Structures are given as C-alpha cells and as structure tokens.
Amino acid sequence: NVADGLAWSYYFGYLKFVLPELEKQIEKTSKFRSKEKFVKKMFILIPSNCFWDDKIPGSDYDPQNRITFEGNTEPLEKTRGGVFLRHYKHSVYEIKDGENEPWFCIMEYATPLLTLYDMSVAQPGELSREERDAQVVVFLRKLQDILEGDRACQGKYELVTFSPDRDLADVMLRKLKDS
Amino acid sequence: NVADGLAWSYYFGYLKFVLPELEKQIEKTSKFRSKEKFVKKMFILIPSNCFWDDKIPGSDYDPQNRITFEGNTEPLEKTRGGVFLRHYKHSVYEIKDGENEPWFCIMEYATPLLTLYDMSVAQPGELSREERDAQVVVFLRKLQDILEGDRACQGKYELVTFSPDRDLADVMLRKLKDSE
Ligand SMILES: Nc1nc(=O)c2ncn([C@@H]3O[C@@H]4COP(=O)(O)O[C@H]5[C@@H](O)[C@H](n6cnc7c(N)ncnc76)O[C@@H]5COP(=O)(O)O[C@@H]3[C@@H]4O)c2[nH]1
C-alpha cells in the first residue's frame, strides 16, 4: 500500500516525462553524443537493502573502482508545483570493461526506496525492517507494472535489481552486454 | 496507508534538508534580503482537490492576478540517489494588497498530493475519489506530525490549506497579516 504510492509518485512525478525524452536529452551534449557503447536508457538501480551511497564513483558497491562519473547530463527544466524551471538531470558514468572499450550509461537509484529505508530507521514502529523488505518487492512489481503500461517508456529504462553484496560493476556489465 | 509514505518521502527527500536553512538560502540574494514584508518560510500549498496549475502567477486560483513570480532562490546542491548535485530551489512570489505595500513569500504546492490526484484518475479502482479525500487528511496530519517532531524545521514552514474555490491571494494575505 505504502510502496504503491511511492511507485506512482516515482512515475507521475518523474519517469513519465523524463524517460520519453531521455535519449533526445543526451544527444544535446557533444561529449556524450560522439560516444560509442553508450546505451541511451536509464538504469534504475534497485538495491534490496534500500540503502546506498548517494555517490556511486568508488562507492561500497564499486570495490574495484571500475565505475567513474562522466559529468551530469543537460538538466531538464520544467515548472512544477509553483517551482519555476525545476531541474531534472541525470549522471553519466564510465564502466571499465577490462581491455575492451569502456561502457557509458545513465545510472540512478530508485529514490522512493530511500524513503523506505529512512522510515525503517527513523520510525521502526510504523515500518519495521521486516515490513520494509516486503514493500520493496511490491514497489518493484508495481513500478514494473506501471512502466509496462506506458508505450512512451518502452525500451527507455532498465530495472537493475541487486543485493548490496554484489559488485555493481559486474552486475552492470552483464545488462550492458545484453543490449 | 499510501498517504503515510507520501508524507515521509516529502520529508526525507525534501523538507528535512531544505527547511532548516531556507532562510539563510534566501539571504544569499541581494534582491531578497533588503526586501520588506518578506517572510522567509515555505508556504506549502495544500489544495483539497489535490490539483493545481504549476504556474501560480495568473493561475486559476489567482483570478485578480495579484500574485507575481519574483524569481527563484539560489539552488541548494546535494548529491542524492547516484545523481550528483541535484538542484533544490524555490520560487519567490509577490502578492498585491490593493494600493498598500505588497507581500513577499515562498510558495510551493505539496507535490506528493499530485500523485494522489493522478492515482485517482488513472486507476480509480485502486484509489477512488472518496478514498482520495480520506488520504489527503491522513497526509496532512502525518506531515504535521513529522515536521513538528523536527526542531530544525520549527517555524520555517507554513501549511496553507484551502479549497480551489477560494482566492489564493486572499488566503495568503490573510495568513500573512494574521501572523503580524
Ligand atoms: N516542490 C518540490 N520541489 C523539489 O525540488 C522536490 N524534490 C522532491 N520533492 C518531493 O519530495 C518527495 C520525495 O522526493 P524524492 O526524491 O524521494 O522522489 C522523487 C524522485 O524519485 C523523482 N524526482 C523528482 N524530481 C527529481 C529530480 N529533480 N531528480 C531526480 N529525481 C527526481 O520523482 C519523485 C517524486 O517527485 P515529486 O513529485 O516532485 O515530489 C517529491 C516527492 O514527493 C520536491 N517537491
């Protein structure tokens, strides 16, 4: 129930209007446009623990330092909720693929998940650590259900679920190859 | 409870770190500090319908067109969810009081409410308009409880509840004047 609202908010307040124009947005940067092996879809990071380092380069998920920040994308300006020209931008990362050419992709954590974690820590009485795990599952399936119902979001995103024990670089490299 | 999550997200993902220094953020702009009748607190707009025009100046809520966009504040930069330096800024508005001196304040709609509205329209089976009305109340009470439990957020915000039939300019002028 609570995860349901977070999934809808994640769509209506973000994904619905940032995914259809994600490809077009990236092309505005020469540094990004001239790039090969750059998948033009949002890789939504969904860790099972619901916690992450807001900074991915050299994060705990990236032990070998194969992931590197390539600068943000052109910020999308949109007026919403009385706030003029609110900024919607994404971070481009560089993933070393051994001796091969490095990979480039947009990586973002599912921000509603941070609410679930913070709730479990700040108010364990409303959301227990056990209850938190259940809502993550609901969130994923609900979000997937919503996005699958949006033709404009078709092939504009990739849900990357992984446990925090996994090497983010390894997990990412597989999905990057599978494209 | 869906409204509970929306309230917590509105806090943890926004209000918790934008409210305590909201005043200081405003002072960074020369045009704003020297301004009189300028309350340095976020007036969170909470319409009962949960729907609004994203542009308040000359909006449907502002018939007499007394509200005017006076520019945004210096954006607060913070890296969140793998996104480097997300921008968190607010819009300053000017409210005309007839021939008298105008008022200045930050006005924002409660963005989680738009989710409640959109849910009621897209999937009425999951969230009916009757259930939506109940969830707005829960959201409001929850949001108040959360903010009241944070002294850093004390007296740095103002919840402005109103029906979409009322004149936003009037309601705001009332709230601003009653706070002396
Ligand atoms: N008025 C206003 N100005 C803001 O800057 C702002 N930032 C957040 N919020 C509201 O706080 C709550 C929690 O924030 P969160 O990041 O976890 O979820 C966000 C986040 O997952 C995603 N999103 C929205 N804007 C951005 C953005 N600029 N960058 C990345 N992700 C974003 O979409 C969700 C819903 O956004 P909103 O529908 O605008 O309202 C949010 C939300 O209800 C804001 N409200």
Nearest Cα neighbor of B176 from B96, B108, B114 is B96
Q: Are residues A19 and A66 in the same domain?
A: no
Q: Are residues B68 and B127 in the same domain?
A: yes
- The CATH number of the domain holding residue A12 is 1.20.5.5200
Domain carrying residue B2: 1-38
The two structure tokens encoding residue A155? 């092939």
CB contact under 8 A, A108 and B6: no
Q: Are residues A15 and A84 in the same domain?
A: no
Angle at A91 between CA A87 and CA A96, to 5 degrees: 175
Other C-beta atoms closer than 10 Å to the C-beta of A91 total 22
Q: Which among A56, A82, A83 has CB closest to B82?
A: A56
Nearest Cα neighbor of B81 from A110, A18, A91 is A110
Q: Which amino acid is at A173?
A: L
In the block, residue with structure tokens 């949001």: B143
Q: Are residues A96 and A26 in the same domain?
A: no
Q: Are residues B68 and B82 in the same domain?
A: yes
Q: Are A85 and B72 in contact (CB under 8 A)?
A: yes
Q: From chain B, pick out residues whose CB is under 8 angstroms from the CB of A69.
A: 84
Q: Are residues B107 and B20 in the same domain?
A: no
The two structure tokens encoding residue B92? 């300053």
B91 lines ligand 1 (CB under 6 A): no
| Experimental technique used to determine this entry | X-ray
Burial of B167 (0-12, 13-18, 19+ CB in 10 A): middle
For B39-65, b where at least 16 C-beta lie within 10 A, e where not — what string?
bbbbbbbbbbebbbeeebbeeebbeee
Distance CA A132, CA A50 (A): 9
The angle that helices B2-10 and A2-10 make with each other, rounded to 10 degrees, is 50
Ligand 1 atom at shortest distance from the alpha carbon of B108: 1
Q: Are residues B124 and B168 in the same domain?
A: yes
Distance CA A50, CA A72 (A): 23
Choose one of A6, A14, A22, A143 to mutate for the ligand 1 pocket test, by most ligand atoms within 8 angstroms of C-beta: A14
Q: Are residues A111 and A139 in the same domain?
A: yes
Nearest Cα neighbor of A176 from A152, A158, A154 is A158
**Closest residue in A to B71 (Cα–Cα):** A84
- The CATH number of the domain holding residue A173 is 3.40.50.12100
Q: Are residues A31 and A101 in the same domain?
A: no
Q: Are residues B75 and B164 in the same domain?
A: yes
For the residues of A36-56, what is the DSSP string, one character each? SSEEEEEEEEEETTS---S--
The two structure tokens encoding residue A77? 């300006």
Q: Are B67 and B3 in contact (CB under 8 A)?
A: no
**Beta-carbon contacts of residue B154 (< 8 Å; ≥ 6 apart):** none
Put simply, whether B4 touches A (Cβ < 8 Å) is yes
Rounded to the nearest 5 percent, the helix, strand and coil shares of chain B are: 40, 25, 35
For A45-75, b where at least 16 C-beta lie within 10 A, e where not — what string?
bbbbebbbeeebbeeebbeeebbbbbebbeb
Say how many CA atoms lie within 13 Å of A101 toward its Cβ.
8
Q: Are residues A61 and A73 in the same domain?
A: yes
Nearest Cα neighbor of A140 from A3, A14, A2 is A3
Put simply, whether A5 touches B (Cβ < 8 Å) is yes
The two structure tokens encoding residue B114? 């738009």
Question: A173 — phi, psi (to 5°)?
Answer: -60, -35
CA A79 distance to own-chain centroid: 22
Q: Give the start-end residues of each E strand in chain A.
A: 38-47, 67-72, 76-80, 83-88, 91-95, 103-109, 157-162
Relative to beta strand A157-162, strand B91-95 is unpaired
Burial of A39 (0-12, 13-18, 19+ CB in 10 A): middle
Note which residues in 94-153 of chain A have CB less than 8 A from chain B.
107-112, 114-116, 118-119, 122-123, 126
Q: Is B109 annotated as a binding residue?
A: yes
**Beta-carbon contacts of residue A76 (< 8 Å; ≥ 6 apart):** A18, A21, A25, A87, A88, A89
Nearest Cα neighbor of A44 from A140, A110, A113 is A110
Q: Are residues A81 and A14 in the same domain?
A: no
Q: Is A23 annotated as a binding residue?
A: no
Total domains in chain A come to: 2
Q: Are B175 and B159 in contact (CB under 8 A)?
A: no
Distance CA A161, CA A149 (A): 20
B9 lines ligand 1 (CB under 6 A): yes
Resolution (A): 2.1
In the block, residue with structure tokens 């954006």: B75
Choose one of B14, B91, B142 to mutate for the ligand 1 pocket test, by most ligand atoms within 8 angstroms of C-beta: B14
